[PDB]
Amino acid sequence: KDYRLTYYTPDYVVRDTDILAAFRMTPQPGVPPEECGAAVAAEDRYKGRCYDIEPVPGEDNQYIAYVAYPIDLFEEGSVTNMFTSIVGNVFGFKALRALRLEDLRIPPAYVKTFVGPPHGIQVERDKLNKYGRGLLGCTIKPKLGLSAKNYGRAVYECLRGGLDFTKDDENVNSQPFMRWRDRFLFVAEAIYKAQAETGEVKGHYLNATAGTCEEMMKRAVCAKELGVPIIMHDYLTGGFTANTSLAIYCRDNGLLLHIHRAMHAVIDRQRNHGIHFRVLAKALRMSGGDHLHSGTVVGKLEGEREVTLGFVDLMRDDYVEKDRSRGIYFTQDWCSMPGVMPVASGGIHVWHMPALVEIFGDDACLQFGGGTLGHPWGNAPGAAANRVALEACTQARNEGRDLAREGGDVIRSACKWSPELAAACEV
Amino acid sequence: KDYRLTYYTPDYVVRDTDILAAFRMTPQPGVPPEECGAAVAAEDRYKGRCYDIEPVPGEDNQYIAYVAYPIDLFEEGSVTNMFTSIVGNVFGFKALRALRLEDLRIPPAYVKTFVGPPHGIQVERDKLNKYGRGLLGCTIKPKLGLSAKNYGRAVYECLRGGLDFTKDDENVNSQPFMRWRDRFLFVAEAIYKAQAETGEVKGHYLNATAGTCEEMMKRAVCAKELGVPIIMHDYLTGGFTANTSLAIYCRDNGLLLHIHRAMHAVIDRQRNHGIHFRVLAKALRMSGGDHLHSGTVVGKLEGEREVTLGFVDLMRDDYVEKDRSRGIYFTQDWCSMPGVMPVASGGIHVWHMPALVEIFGDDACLQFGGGTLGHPWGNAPGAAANRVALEACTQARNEGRDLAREGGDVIRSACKWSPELAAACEV
Amino acid sequence: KDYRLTYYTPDYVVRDTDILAAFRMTPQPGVPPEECGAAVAAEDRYKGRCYDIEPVPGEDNQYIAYVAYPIDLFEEGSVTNMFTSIVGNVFGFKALRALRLEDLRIPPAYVKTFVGPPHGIQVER
Amino acid sequence: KDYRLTYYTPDYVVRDTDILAAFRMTPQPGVPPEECGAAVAAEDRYKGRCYDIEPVPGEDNQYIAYVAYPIDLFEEGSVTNMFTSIVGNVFGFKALRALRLEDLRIPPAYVKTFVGPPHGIQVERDKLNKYGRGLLGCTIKPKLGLSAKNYGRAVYECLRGGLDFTKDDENVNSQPFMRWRDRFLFVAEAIYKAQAETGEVKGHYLNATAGTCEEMMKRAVCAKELGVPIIMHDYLTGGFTANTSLAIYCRDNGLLLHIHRAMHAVIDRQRNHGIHFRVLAKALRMSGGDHLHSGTVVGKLEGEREVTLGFVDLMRDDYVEKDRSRGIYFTQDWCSMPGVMPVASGGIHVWHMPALVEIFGDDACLQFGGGTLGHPWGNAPGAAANRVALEACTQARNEGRDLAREGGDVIRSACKWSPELAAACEV
Amino acid sequence: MMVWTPVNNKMFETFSYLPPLSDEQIAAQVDYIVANGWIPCLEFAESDKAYVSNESAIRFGSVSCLYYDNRYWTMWKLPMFGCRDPMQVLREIVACTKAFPDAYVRLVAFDNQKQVQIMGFLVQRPKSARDWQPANKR
Amino acid sequence: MMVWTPVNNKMFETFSYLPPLSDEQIAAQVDYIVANGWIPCLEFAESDKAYVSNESAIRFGSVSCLYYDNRYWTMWKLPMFGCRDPMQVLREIVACTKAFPDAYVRLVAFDNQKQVQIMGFLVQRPKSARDWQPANKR
């Protein structure tokens, strides 16, 4: 609700403490772009002001409104306050038909007010003593219905064969068939047993997402006292206040925090309207989390591939240049806030592994929920078949081979000496 | 991801403990409605099964998939688990183009596992000793930039003239210009002073939305110890875990819990895709809250008026019949869970008051953020002008007059003997 | 203790997140001002670098060394860490005879990490 | 501000409970020494009285004012109150041009009110089971920029080769590149590993200096629960209230307390003005600390050597006679308060080791921050080369050899049978 | 249908599910370490300090999360600063196992600008150890 | 460039980084113990009670800071009160290792006026122990 004079300031020079926002903005037919753009800014020292409006090429009725916000509008250390100020009221506004917040700029004077991710990519990798390759994961296949004993038996055989992590389903919290505390012991019995056998560090993301903040801290105290490495949290359904609380507890006691993204496609799927995932991934980093589901890249065109490589750089890097081709609309200095490791849901089989090593490199977790479970020999040969294929593709990268072309000839060179991969090569 | 045989069971009879869901479902061109509908259900004792698919009249490519869920899929007392199971993964599914969850059915075996709203409509009304009329409210007009002293001075003059509640802006949390604890004292000095003058109970919704669960409980301890009646919480930006934690604290210490709905139009605005507000309003009731912004009804057509009357009955009533005209797709027994008072943003002026009394009746709060502030005499005559117009329209209802027709002649009969309303009648 | 090449960078442009310090700096007789000024900075991503040296008018042997510090050297919210990094070791250094830290610049990315005064002038009043 | 009659009492006899102070006092030109000396005392049962004024030989305008203070001016157990009474206001006084407090006398009725150092020299030496030689130390060479993993790897190889302690840099607290709690684990993994290999007790001074008293106790709880032996504290930048709090916690839980002296040369360097280190070292002992950086003695004339031997006797001994040649201006009975072990920063090479054994004897820690790191073979041969040279010089002392003369012939007798020292003999 | 074996099947994290690296394959990895500005370095451990253990947690309170033992191995000499030739690294593998015939050896790498450990992979197993299966582990 | 060895290289705190003391060098230290009023005394431990361990901390809460085991060794006879002759101490080293051929021996000293232990240094290693390297430990 602007009068277009005070909230549309194109002659304005943005500050280095300003929060900048980039809205994809569809007006009603007959509303001017400048009046609609100043209304997104309106929602004198505290006004948000639209400072630039660009047409979108190919879309006859879409625009990019750039809105600057003074840093005094915000609470130190609060993603709840940052989302409530920027997207709290504007999407119900009637003069626009659809609105998408595309990117934010978080200025380094406000990045520094947050605690952030408890460890980050570099510290987690030091603590798990796993270097030079991607981490590997597996969701336990039947999401619900197991006993707690039979859950850890599925957790034991997967970590045994070579994987680095196993994963609770995000709707595995505490149900009548498997309560949460019976699960945390059979998981910790299965982690400490698969660890002592392989000699490698093992983990399972124990779901500490809970009904209240007090249940949630009670699960997390339990993982502290078993000494297990990592818990997970649904943060768009638990919320940012519960997430930031858990992420500070995880820093204060050395637990790692996997972050799952349940309910993300309610918010980020549609192109004309919502909040795109790169905003929700910047906000997770500011709130904190050590891992974050970034999605699949296999089975997709190379227009969503460049966008997916854009929000993975916002998660991992320290300084991300402006790049409109990857969907990055601002420049993001992260001011030595630690990186978040992206978790990429790998395909059904092992032949997507040369695609994922070339796209992601080393700093990524890779998950095969039906890759380890669907092996004809079981969980421990299936977990070896991924681990053999992962390390074979990693070696062909360091030797210099192009995994976009020679990636089939590297898997087939490892079907020879390894029977476990060959049984998965046969499917 | 269904094979359409196991997850599409049209011969199935639903249970009285089943969670039922109704999805508005747009397929990709070429995908059958039954295969797309069973895939929403698929995401044997734990499977969700699509049991009915209806075409949508007027939409050539939309359908209503009804999915039943067994009660064992869910945690007792957890809205986080209920949303993570139902809308946690399905919206990113590729065979449908858009998906909207329209309604849920919460069965009475799962309504009873929740604590719910701390007081409800009937207990709050007893405690504030306000009967037989709607409650009145006002947001303090400048959202940011006041001092804390000048905030309560705006809070003092509004509650003085006749209003029952004043309101923090939802992005007023704790900022460099007005910290939260300096605000809670000048509010409590302004509530206790406007109370002693009028002899009526007064309140201000002190925003306890915070960055962490520990900040949030620290604000709420502060309102407990000042003895002020009511706090507020942004629950779609603070999350359901923080909300349910606060709502249990509010029950355990007799505070009331206003609930604001920042970020609702990211989720509920678009018709083909998202989660409609009536699901988010059922879920607020299960989580808990004493008041909830239900929106405006004035300035709207009578197709959104019947929908708005539908989710207000889900908030207030105990037993809501199935009614497709009001958007109610199931029958909801609330099993003596207390009602939530809807907060309705009234118009700019006092002439929308005969509309709001006829639409809402008594069990509603009505807010005039620019109705009290925009009076030419100030805040205390402006707060009287609403309070005079509210009680005049209430009296004309009890005397039997039709406020849809004679509502202008009732305001004009009160412009005569009251100078404060006449100065607002003149604008 | 500088080799004067790495810690005396006059071509350097300071950052908006840099902590800047201004030292009034008296050398020993025979020590150059640039070598003495880079030694205050020395005490590559974490080095403090003297970026400007000015004579003091009227004082024949005093100088103003301007030293920049990267913001990563410091703890969020800690005046103990800020003083321990800047004045923790330099005053015992032997090639200068006397040293006064005159001013600091606290950048707004590090002002925001502190809680600060509980009320301030406007709230107390 | 004295009238010179009441505050200059040369006929006064001091008490055995009096706090005595000795000020080096430079007047303005024209102010008498007695009037300037009584003004330092003035700042009847509570007055401090200047009782003796001596000229300084060689300085034409300096004097030694001796001021006595009644014991009732002071809080039991408080170094904050003791400094605030004695040096809290006098240095801004206008009739003197410069002022240095040189020594204090703490009377045994006020020494006994303090808790003091947690263990002392005799108990620490029993607990570490290291006898008959000086302790050895090393700062990890790059102060900032390591990871936490690569920090302990530098900590592991140094303690492995023969050293007794490694040391955090005093500005290593908690920074974005190495948070404090990630550091405390890789240190404790490196201490317990270098301990199990050598069979000797090992430690690292983990910097518990922090931003608030609550952060500081949170680091110290962490060292309690890892069971690591020793933490360190910057006490002139953390302050005496934080130090005395930590020193009581260290007594109550058996941790040792290394004390670093950041910011000491702001206060103690200039001769005409400040507080000399022997006052600040008496005050550290009363506050508490088990080790204290006393400085270098190598590379200095033998007028600062006799002064350095004076404040080391104030740290270690029980009863220190008056000795004007060593700068000791009073007699100090320490009344069985435990000693503080001085930490002496050794030179760049191993040839200063016969100097340090003769100056300090056994009760000293010796640190080689660039002696172990600068060895051409690494950290573990460099740590052996000091440990071989330390024990060789210690043996030549017990055999009776003069290390002031024959100390080069003792190092060269150990370059023969030890290759590690010979590689450092060659540099 | 086979069974992955649980008995004497210890592994090291990178390149252990592969058959043992030849001297040409170790030289191919050091070429990757030198092609960017990384610094190769060798480590070693005996049979009892090689893989992970819990034994120092007898001294702990509840601070045991992500603490392990035997994640540090002893460095062999110093990191090869300014290393351009991969055969200079490969001479040190023979030189290390001559000094320690009962020791595992891993080649780690460190980044110069990031100051962190980059890649770490086992390049030698002892013959006297029965902790590992010779690539036919079913 | 050499590597300090991690394998079987246990040390005792004083004079262990030196080659083993001769009987003239042990007599030179006892002359230093007798030149002031100190009281020499011998101790001994087996191979399992010689160096430091954590094993009693299985019984603890979080009171483990600066607790170790095997810091006490068993005293051999009694402290030599009024000891003027260093050969009387040196006869007891031969007499102790005859009774205990599998035992380390250290000579400790105690102060009389301060009533505390002053110096303590290993004077004998067993031959049957493979815990130490014979001074060529690289």
- In chain D the domains, ranked by start, together with CATH numbers, are 5-114 (3.30.70.150), 115-427 (3.20.20.110)
Q: How far is F136 from chain D (nearest CA, A)?
A: 8
- Alpha-carbon span B189 to B182, nearest angstrom: 11
Between helices D79-86 and D240-253, what is the axis angle to 10°?
A: 160
Strand order in the sheet with D19-27: D49-55, D63-69, D19-27, D96-105, D274-275
- Nearest-CA neighbor of E121 among E48, E31, E39, E43? E43
Q: Best mutation site among E2, E5, E11, E13 for testing chain A: the one with the most A CBs within 10 Å? A: E13
What is the spatial distance between Cα B348 and Cα B370, in angstroms, rounded to a whole number?
6
Q: Which amino acid is at D165?
A: F
Instruction: Please report the DSSP string for F77-120 in residue order.
Output: S---TT---HHHHHHHHHHHHHH-TT-EEEEEEEESSS-SEEEE
Torsion B357-B358-B361-B366 (CA) sign: negative
Q: Directed axis angle between helix A213-226 and helix A180-198, to 10°?
A: 30
Chains D and B touch (3+ CB pairs under 8 A): no
Nearest to B81 by CA among A347, D341, A168: A168
Cα D282 to Cα A332: distance, rounded to the nearest angstrom: 51
- Do the beta carbons of residue D6 and residue D89 sit within 8 Å? no
Secondary structure of residue A160 in the 3-state scheme: helix
Q: Is D161–F4 a contact, with Cβ atoms under 8 angstroms apart? A: yes
Candidates B50, B93, B88, B52; CA nearest to B69 is B50
Q: How far apart are CA B383 and CA B381, in angstroms?
A: 5
Q: How far is CA B366 from CA B164, B260, B420, in A?
A: 10, 14, 19
Known binding positions of B for substrate: 89, 139, 143, 261, 293, 345
Q: Do C113 and A108 count as a contact with CB atoms less than 8 A apart?
A: no
Beta partners for residue B207, in sequence order: B232
Q: Which residues of B409-425 are buried (b: 16+ CB within 10 A; e: fewer)?
A: ebbeebbeebebbebbb
Both tokens of D379, joined, read 């950290």
Q: Determine, for residues F18 and D395 on separate chains, whether the beta-carbon distance falls below 8 Å.
A: yes
User: In angstroms, rounded to a whole number, what is the distance separating the alpha carbons of residues E78 and E80?
Assistant: 6
CB D162 within 8 Å of CB D384: yes
Q: Is E48 exposed, middle or buried, given 0-12, 13-18 or 19+ CB atoms closer than 10 A?
A: exposed
The domain limits of chain E are: 1-138
Asked if D225's CB is within 8 angstroms of E60's CB, the reply is yes
The residue written with tokens 């994963």 in the block is A167
Residues of D serving a catalytic function are 141, 260
Output the six-digit token pair for A314.
């916002």
Residue-level length of chain F: 138
Does E69 reach chain D within 8 Å, measured CB to CB? Answer: yes
Closest CA to F14 of D397, D297, D188, D120: D397
DSSP E68: -
Asked if A190 and A183 touch (Cβ cutoff 8 Å), the reply is: no
Residues from C in contact with A at Cβ < 8 Å:
16-17, 71-72, 76, 108-113
Greatest CA separation found in chain A?
Answer: 73
Tokens of B282: 């059922």
What is the dihedral angle through the alpha carbons of B101, B107, B108, B111, rounded to the nearest 10 degrees? -40
**Can you tell me the distance from the alpha carbon of F19 to that of B208, in angstroms, rounded to the nearest whole number?**
71
How far away is chain C from the Cα of D3, in angstroms, using its nearest Cα? 35
Contact of D155 with D126, CB cutoff 8 Å: no
Decide if B148 and C119 are in contact by the 8 Å CB cutoff: no
Helix, strand, coil abundance in chain B, percent, nearest 5:
45, 20, 40
Task: For residue B175, give the nearest of A74, A70, A114 by alpha carbon.
Answer: A74
Compute the Cα dihedral for B34, B36, B37, B42 and give only its sign.
Answer: positive
Coil, strand, or helix at residue B166?
Answer: strand
The minimal CB distance from E17 to the residues A384, A399, A419 is found for A384
Subunits close to D (at least 3 CB pairs below 8 A): A, C, E, F
Residue of A202, A233, A258, A260 marked active site? A260
- Both tokens assigned to A51: 């400072």
Burial of D30 (0-12, 13-18, 19+ CB in 10 A): exposed
Cα E133-E137-E138 angle, rounded to 5 deg? 175
d(CA A375, CA A354): 19
Which of D146, D218, D246, D263 would best serve as a mutation to test chain C binding (most C beta carbons within 10 A)? Answer: D263
Contact yes or no for A113/C112 (Cβ under 8 A): yes
Instruction: Provide the 3-class DSSP secondary structure of residue B353.
Output: helix
Active site annotation includes A349 = no
Q: Do E10 and A199 lie within an 8 Å CB cutoff?
A: yes
Which of B150, B174, B178, B179 best probes binding to C when mutated, by most C CB atoms within 10 angstroms?
Answer: B179
Say whether A83 and B244 touch across the interface (CB within 8 A).
Answer: no
What's the rounded Cα separation, in Å, for the pair A207 and B226? 38
Partner residue facing C17 (CB), from A76, A108, A113: A108
Q: Cβ neighbours of residue A229 under 8 Å, at least 6 residues apart?
A: A127, A128, A201, A203, A255, A256, E65, E66
- The whole-angstrom separation of Cα A370 and Cα B129 is 60
- How were these coordinates obtained? cryo-EM
Residue D364 neighbours by CB under 8 Å, 6+ apart: D134, D135, D312, D341, D342, D343, D344, D356
The alpha-carbon gap from F138 to the nearest alpha carbon of chain E, in Å, equals 10
Residues of B classed as catalytic: 141, 260
Please give the resolution of this entry in Å, rounded to 1 decimal.
2.7
The CA distance from D419 to F4, in Å, is 10
Residue C73 to residue C51: CA distance in whole angstroms: 18
Region at A30 (left for phi over 0; alpha for psi -120 to 50; beta for the rest) = left
D405 strand-pairing partners: none
C-alpha pair distances (Å), C124 with each of B149, B150, C117, C121: 10, 13, 11, 5
Q: Whose CA is closest to A177, among A222, A143, A219? A: A143
Q: Compute the distance between CA of residue D2 and CA of residue D28 in angstroms, rounded to an integer.
A: 16
DSSP A55: E
> What DSSP assignment string belongs to D340-385?
-EEEEE--SSGGGHHHHHHHH-SS-EEE-TTTTTT-SS-SHHHHHH
Decide if A94 is catalytic.
no
Please tell me the distance from the alpha carbon of residue D133 to that of residue D136, in angstroms, as a whole number: 9
Closest CA of chain E from D150, distance in Å:
7
Nearest alpha-carbon partner for B340 in B320, B311, B308: B311
Chains that touch F (3 or more CB pairs under 8 A): D, E
N- to C-terminal Cα separation, chain D:
60
d(CA A268, CA A169): 21
Contact E120 A199 (CB under 8 A): no
Residue with tokens 């020193």: D247
Chains near B, with 3+ CB pairs < 8 A? Answer: A, C
Q: How far is CA C106 from the centre of its chain?
A: 11
Residue contact B237–A84, C-beta within 8 A: yes
Q: What is the dihedral of CA A104, A105, A111, A114, to 10 degrees?
A: -10
User: Which one of A112, A318, A335, A337 would you mutate to disrupt binding with C, by most C Cβ within 10 Å of its Cβ?
Assistant: A112
Residue of chain D whose alpha carbon sits nearest to that of A334 = D176
